[PDB]
C-alpha cells in the first residue's frame, strides 16, 4: 500500500494584477489532508495529531522558515517574470511537489509547475526542465531559474532528503488512522431522467477511496457510469453508480466491491 500514500504538497498562486496576489497550500498523504497553508498566516497548519511525522519541533520550524521565504520570493519572482515577458494578468500558477516512498528505503519525487492549468516546467534531478508542449518564453524563464544554484540545491534537498524521510515518519505516526476501514451503506433509487430511466446505486460513508460499483444483468456487466467519488466532511466518500437504460430492463443488479467488506460484495437487485 506504500504507493497509495504519496505526499502531495500543492500550491495555488493567484495574481489578479500587479497589486493583488494570494498563495494557499495543502499537503495530502494519500487521500488524507495532513496540512493547510493560508495566505493570512505566517505558519503551515497541521490538521492531524501525527501531521509532524517524527520531525522535532525545531526541525519543523526550519521548514516553516523555508516555506515562508519560498512564499514571498515566489510571488516576487512571478511578478518579475510577467514584467520581463509582458505576460498580462490575471495569472494563475500551481505547484504539485512531493514524493512517494517504495520498499527497501527507495523513493520517487516530483516538482510540477503549471501556468493557467497547463504544465509548463518541472524539476528534473538537479535543474528545472520545460514540458514537451511548453512555449518558447518558458525556455527563457528556466535559463534564469537554473542560474540560481542555491535554489536548485534547496529543492534537491527537500525532494531527495526531507520528503522521503517525512512520509516514512508520517506512515509510522499515522499507521492506525491510515489502516481504518469504514463499511458503506448501499441502496437503489429511481434516478430522474426520452424513453429512458436512470438507475441509481448509492454507495455511502465508505473509507478508503478505492471502490468498484457496477450495474449487472448476474454475471454480465453493462455500460456502468460511476460518477465522481464525492467527498464528505468526515473524510468518508459518496458514490452514485448510475445506469442509463430503456423502460422495463428490470432484471439488473448492482455489485458493490470495497475493502471494508473483506472479499465479499454487496449485491442489490431492484
Amino acid at each position, epitope marked *: 500500500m506504500q504507493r497509495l500514500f504519496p505526499l502531495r504538497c500543492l500550491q495555488i498562486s493567484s495574481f489578479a494584477n500587479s497589486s493583488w496576489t494570494r498563495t494557499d497550500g495543502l499537503a495530502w498523504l494519500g487521500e488524507l489532508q495532513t496540512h493547510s497553508w493560508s495566505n493570512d498566516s505566517d505558519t503551515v497548519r497541521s490538521l492531524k495529531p501525527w501531521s509532524q511525522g517524527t520531525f522535532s519541533d*525545531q526541525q519543523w*520550524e*526550519t521548514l516553516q*522558515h*523555508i516555506f515562508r521565504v519560498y512564499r514571498s520570493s515566489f510571488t516576487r519572482d512571478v511578478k518579475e517574470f510577467a514584467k520581463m515577458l509582458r505576460l498580462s494578468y490575471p495569472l494563475e500558477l500551481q505547484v504539485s511537489a512531493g514524493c512517494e516512498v517504495h520498499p527497501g528505503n527507495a523513493s520517487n519525487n516530483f516538482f510540477h509547475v503549471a501556468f493557467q492549468g497547463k504544465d509548463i516546467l518541472s524539476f528534473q534531478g538537479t535543474s528545472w526542465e520545460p514540458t514537451q508542449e511548453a512555449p518558447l518564453w518558458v525556455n527563457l524563464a528556466i535559463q534564469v531559474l537554473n542560474q540560481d544554484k542555491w535554489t536548485r540545491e534547496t529543492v534537491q*534537498w527537500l525532494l531527495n*532528503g*526531507t520528503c522521503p524521510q517525512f512520509v516514512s515518519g508520517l506512515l509510522e505516526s499515522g499507521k492506525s488512522e491510515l489502516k481504518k476501514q469504514v463499511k458503506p451503506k448501499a441502496w437503489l433509487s429511481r434516478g430522474p431522467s426520452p424513453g429512458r430511466l436512470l438507475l441509481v446505486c448509492h454507495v455511502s460513508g465508505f473509507y478508503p477511496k478505492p471502490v468498484w460499483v457496477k450495474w449487472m444483468r448476474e454475471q454480465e456487466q453493462q455500460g456502468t457510469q460511476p460518477g465522481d467519488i464525492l467527498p464528505n466532511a468526515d473524510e468518508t466518500w459518496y458514490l452514485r453508480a448510475t445506469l442509463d437504460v430503456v423502460a422495463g430492463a428490470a432484471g439488473l443488479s448492482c455489485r458493490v466491491k470495497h475493502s471494508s467488506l473483506e472479499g465479499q460484495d454487496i449485491v442489490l437487485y431492484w
Partner: nanobody
Amino acid sequence: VQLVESGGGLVQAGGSLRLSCAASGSSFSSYTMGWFRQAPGKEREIVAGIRWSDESPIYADSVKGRFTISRDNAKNTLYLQMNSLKPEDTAVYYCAARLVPPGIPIPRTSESMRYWGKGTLVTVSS
C-alpha cells in the same frame, strides 16, 4: 542574512581564543551555522558546524578535542572556543549560515553555505 565576526588577533602557541559572530536576521535558531577557515595558499575549509539543540555538532579532525562550537539563540550569536592553538591554526576565520532542511546532514563544504561574513584574522606564533 548579515554576519559579523569578532575576536581575531595574535595568539602565542598553546593559547586560547574565543571567536564570536553576530547575525542580523530573524529565526536565527532555524539557520545552520558554521566556522570556516582559509590559510595562505590552502583552500577554504570547515572547522565546526552546528544546527539543532538535539543534534551533535560537527568538527574537522585537526580541530577535534581542541575547538568547540556553540550558539546562543537568545543573544543571536555563534561562538568558536579555540584551545591549545598551533601555528597550523593560523588562518582567516569566516562565519557562515544556511537554511538546511531536516532530512539533510550539516554540510561540510563551503560551497553549500550562503551567508558569509568578511572574516577575522588569527595568527599563532612559536
